[PDB]
Design an enzyme around this catalytic site. Structure first.
Site, PDB file in Angstrom:
ATOM      1  N   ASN B  83       0.723 -16.275  -2.856  1.00  0.00           N
ATOM      2  CA  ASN B  83       0.904 -15.278  -1.780  1.00  0.00           C
ATOM      3  C   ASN B  83      -0.340 -14.432  -1.579  1.00  0.00           C
ATOM      4  OD1 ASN B  83       4.057 -14.999  -3.348  1.00  0.00           O
ATOM      5  ND2 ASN B  83       3.781 -15.975  -1.329  1.00  0.00           N
ATOM      6  N   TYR B  85      -4.258 -14.478   0.051  1.00  0.00           N
ATOM      7  CA  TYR B  85      -5.214 -15.209   0.904  1.00  0.00           C
ATOM      8  C   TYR B  85      -6.477 -15.457   0.118  1.00  0.00           C
ATOM      9  CZ  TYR B  85      -2.383 -14.833   5.100  1.00  0.00           C
ATOM     10  OH  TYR B  85      -1.390 -14.982   6.031  1.00  0.00           O
ATOM     11  N   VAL B  90      -3.210  -9.526  -0.390  1.00  0.00           N
ATOM     12  CA  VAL B  90      -1.886  -9.817  -0.898  1.00  0.00           C
ATOM     13  C   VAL B  90      -0.796  -9.675   0.156  1.00  0.00           C
ATOM     14  CG1 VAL B  90      -0.186  -9.152  -2.587  1.00  0.00           C
ATOM     15  CG2 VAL B  90      -2.600  -8.730  -3.038  1.00  0.00           C
ATOM     16  N   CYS B  91       0.061 -10.684   0.277  1.00  0.00           N
ATOM     17  CA  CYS B  91       1.185 -10.620   1.203  1.00  0.00           C
ATOM     18  C   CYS B  91       2.438 -10.140   0.477  1.00  0.00           C
ATOM     19  CB  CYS B  91       1.435 -11.988   1.839  1.00  0.00           C
ATOM     20  SG  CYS B  91       0.001 -12.693   2.684  1.00  0.00           S
ATOM     21  N   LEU B  92       2.981  -9.006   0.909  1.00  0.00           N
ATOM     22  CA  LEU B  92       4.117  -8.439   0.256  1.00  0.00           C
ATOM     23  C   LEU B  92       4.961  -7.828   1.327  1.00  0.00           C
ATOM     24  CD1 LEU B  92       5.049  -7.769  -2.667  1.00  0.00           C
ATOM     25  CD2 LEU B  92       3.856  -5.660  -2.408  1.00  0.00           C
TER      26      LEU B  92
END
Lengths: 111, 155
Positions: B83, B85, B90-92
């Site tokens: 998750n 890139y 960070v994708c959250l």
């Protein structure tokens, strides 16, 4: 909003922290801010790089801090433990009376 | 002034109480400025997981629209996680301005949320093909990659 009259070219951050923030405002663990930048913090939790930088700031003239404190600068002062929080308006003043203003600065608006 | 005031509050709050092993502090510049808008953080991997013993650096970038808008959180470029890139972003869910973010979320909650994401990736948020593939189709190779990376980030 307090007013601090002070020679910004001749007084050091240390003078302001000791004579105003600790002594008059009674803040023993102050955080001092100018805009988005922290000029000073104190505590045993700070890492050695941050303490060394804050120690260096204490010895700088106000007008030569990394974020310069000049005529009309507005500082924000908060304490780590006490609920005290203050805004201070800085007014540059060249000269002070040697026996009536012996600390070399004057704080207005404070009880 | 709204962003500064909230970050000053988060700074005090963090210094008085934060979880063990985490670090979160405003960035000091080579000119001596200490910038409340950019914080350098450290997230420990959880004991009992493949992340154990790793202390992972993360930078949090706030804007003048914080806390109406969430900070951008970045691990180093090339950090390995399904998750995250390649850029390190960070994708959250709670960092998503469109849906999960709420102004009341604290820096502590963000960093704990990221720590939780390390060992429990979100299969609906694939950010990098490398992590995401290994995770989904080759767990043994994934596990080896995670443990190797943990060794790159000792305390």
């Amino acid at each position: 909003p307090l007013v601090l009259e002070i020679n910004t070219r001749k007084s050091k951050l240390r003078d302001l922290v000791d004579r105003i923030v600790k002594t008059k405002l009674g803040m023993n663990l102050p955080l001092i801010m100018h805009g988005n930048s922290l000029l000073y913090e104190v505590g045993d939790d700070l890492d050695d790089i941050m303490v060394a930088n804050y120690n260096a700031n204490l010895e700088k003239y106000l007008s030569e801090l990394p974020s310069p404190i000049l005529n009309g600068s507005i500082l924000t002062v908060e304490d780590l433990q006490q609920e005290l929080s203050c805004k201070i308006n800085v007014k540059h003043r060249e000269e002070f009376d040697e026996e009536k203003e012996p600390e070399g600065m004057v704080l207005s608006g404070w009880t | 002034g709204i962003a500064r005031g909230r970050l000053a509050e988060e700074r005090k709050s963090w210094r008085k109480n934060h979880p063990h092993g985490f670090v979160a502090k405003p960035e000091t510049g080579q000119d001596g400025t200490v910038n409340l808008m950019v914080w350098h953080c450290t997230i420990p991997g959880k004991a009992g997981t493949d992340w154990e013993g790793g202390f992972f650096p993360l930078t949090m970038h706030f804007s003048e629209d914080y806390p109406s808008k969430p900070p951008k959180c970045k691990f180093p470029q090339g950090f390995f996680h399904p998750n995250v890139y390649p850029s390190g972003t960070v994708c959250l869910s709670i960092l998503n301005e469109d849906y999960g973010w709420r102004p009341a979320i604290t820096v502590k909650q963000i960093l704990v949320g990221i720590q939780d994401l390390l060992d429990t990736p979100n299969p609906a948020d694939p950010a990098q093909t490398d992590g995401y593939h290994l995770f989904c189709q080759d767990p043994v190779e994934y596990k080896k990659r995670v443990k190797l990376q943990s060794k790159q980030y000792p305390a």
